[model samples]
Target: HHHMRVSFMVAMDENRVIGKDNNLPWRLPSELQYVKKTTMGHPLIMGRKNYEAIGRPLPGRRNIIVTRNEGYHVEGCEVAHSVEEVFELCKNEEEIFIIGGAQIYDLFLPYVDKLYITKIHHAFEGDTFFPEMDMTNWKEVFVEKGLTDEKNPYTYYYHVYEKQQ
Candidate 1:
């Protein structure tokens, strides 16, 4: 059971809005860096649509795509049909980042041992949503707040939560 760690890395508004029309509602360059900085060398697991939203494989990471279509294929990514299979594929990695679309987030939320969240202080409009999670089960481990500027329009903070024992 302790073979590998699964962590979630999400950027959402105060309302928990994560995506719209298959893409992020906000584009914070710094938040993107937080993801790249933390998950660069780890396995990055995402759903098919989330993978397509990027339009290519994320370099220097083991890209695992979850989908129902058995024939679905991406040039530089491994495919898995379910969340369990995704974990199986990444069992050897020290840790993995659940970089996702809505459904994938919901599916893996319960299994992840840690959460890396970018809390956008401002609200945004979005169609897809991050699932409602009970924060009582997790304890904040780290936080770095950032200010609004030309590149990052709204105030945001990166938060890391480790599951409480």
Candidate 2:
């Protein structure tokens, strides 16, 4: 298979907290909506923990779970045992989304071509965090500021970045 575009989609605070106790640390419905809408109809690759946290296949997308356990299985999702297998399974796709927990994010960091990030203005306490990286190799191509309102209290911005050649 030829090279495919690998994209990372995540929400992080100023301090880069992504989760707590295997779940998101905040209640930002708007951010969730942004995730759902942007990732709709695309293939999603995630770790077993992230899959379990979400609990089911997100509708309108192909779910691929990465795990080392050969016996692991999910009724509506495909299981990939290694990074190579994940690529083989998604070979035909033009692009794939990595909706991850921290470890999975680290696993594919080197291959990511695009990044879709929702930056929440405030920091929160959390156990899981987005991996730290140098942004010099990435160029922000788009951004949209999210409003702070009743349902979504935190100020946020949606950013789309592409890896520099």
Candidate 3:
């Protein structure tokens, strides 16, 4: 295995829902910039659904898509059939961000070194959800609160957690 530090980046509601209708349910545009700020230039591993949800591969990052269909293909991104293949594809990367659609998050939770969570302080109905973190194994390292307004309509906070040694 490579010395890559596997990390997860996600935004979810208080109920742990990460996606709705294959996309985000919130209107936090700044969160997109925040994601880019943290993961720009790093390899980003994601499930096919998340890739499709975003419509295309994002620029300035190595996009690695995990899919079960061997025939799955995207123009500018790398494809892997399993999570192991994703890791192998990222062997040269010093760090990787697991940008997900629920299943990918669950699959890599045990191996992630750090987790960046945008916890929206409200509940929403959604089909996909992030797995619950076993706080016993993770330590909250940083957190910053956010507010809601006419533009961004929810109170939220960003949290950074590192795996406990």
Candidate 4:
């Protein structure tokens, strides 16, 4: 079986707030670096709005933007209209990372087999939030504590979870 493993990489506050005004509510360069390190060279599936927030395609990875607009196109990026289309485009990939904007996370939650979550110790006010799911079905496989510094003021923890079989 050559099925691709679907994974999620996201950073959220204690309240599960993920974004505000299409941007991350907190600024943590180290968190950003963690994402890049984990998802480098993998295929990333993201919603159109998420892509717009990013402005450009990330290097060293294949960007697939899911959009309902038929004419949507971006230089050096692939466009998919639906989740099925996204799966089809990434069928050959061994692992696929879902980098989201709330809606995308909801749509792919059922398919996610692994999760790379960065939990910020403090809560923030944000319009967007990570979808609520049953955590009992998942088991934490790894954990890394992040120290607060001048640049990254908030205490955070990096957790790697796998869906229990």
Candidate 5:
């Protein structure tokens, strides 16, 4: 969607390592549970790389994948040839989530209206990076302080941001 407002969403750790290979880096059952619970009924739009990494469709969410190759298909996902298709499919809906694999995020960074992000306290060596945070345009609406648990090594915060007027 060229002019559509895309909302980028993700939960990550301090390492900035979203995933090691094709999947997530840590087994944060809490975050995984959060993903399923939050996105279950809504349509989830992700890139081809993220699609392949999942291996299959999630149980409740309507899954759509953005792929360059017209022939690629996943058993239950609605295969879209481009990001624009996502907007077309989800136009009537109140909210659609943009799941990622880096490239997709870059494409939608400018158009997304809201960003649901989890910020870790530290940064680790990573091949990929989120777009540089710009304070001028984003207003944070929510945040939760993290704890030092086994799964949660450092304090983290969840923030939701919207574009400035």
Candidate 6:
């Protein structure tokens, strides 16, 4: 593994939408569990807004919140003064997870070696979007088809995208 490599993990709708009013517009219990399971033993880096939107740090992962403001605070999470500082916080880790609210994911895109994503098959009007998943730089690694029922209104696919040279 590379010394300072970054990885992004997110679940998005067909429109690449992620948020609505600063929160996830829809619910996907499986996707949430997937995020937790995958990043459980690693470090997660995110922006201040994204961190606040989550309202708390996820358990088992070292949460790093990137913020320009010195006053920002969250229990069980570290504050990063800059993007580079976030990387420095987990420099020894093989791969750090970049959890998002748009801005955070955008900043780490260039350094990300893999992307863990859930692609929801429906589109909706939204305020936030996942960055385009351009295939030129990524190769599909794993996926499982998913279906929707009365319990879950949306259909989606669980997929992992690994970066290609």
Which residue runs of candidate 3 sit more than 4 Å off their true CA positions? Answer: none
Specify the poorest-scoring 10-residue window by lDDT in model 6: 145-154
TM per candidate: 0.95, 0.96, 0.95, 0.96, 0.84, 0.92
lDDT of each: 0.87, 0.91, 0.88, 0.92, 0.72, 0.82
Q: Output the worst ten-in-a-row residue range by lDDT, candidate 4.
A: 1-10
What C-alpha lDDT, on a 0 to 100 scale, does residue 79 get in candidate 1? 94
Residues 17-44, candidate 5: write the lDDT tens digits. 5655666654555656656766667888
Candidate 2 lDDT over 122-162, as tens digits, reads: 97989999999789878999999986899898899999999
The TM-score measured for candidate 2 stands at 0.96
Model 2 spans with C-alpha error above 4 angstroms: none
Model 6, runs deviating above 4 Å: 147-149
lDDT of 1 by residue, 58-141 (tens): 799889999999899889889999977886888788999898888999889778899998888877878988898888878999
What are the runs in model 4 whose C-alpha is more than 4 Å off?
A: none
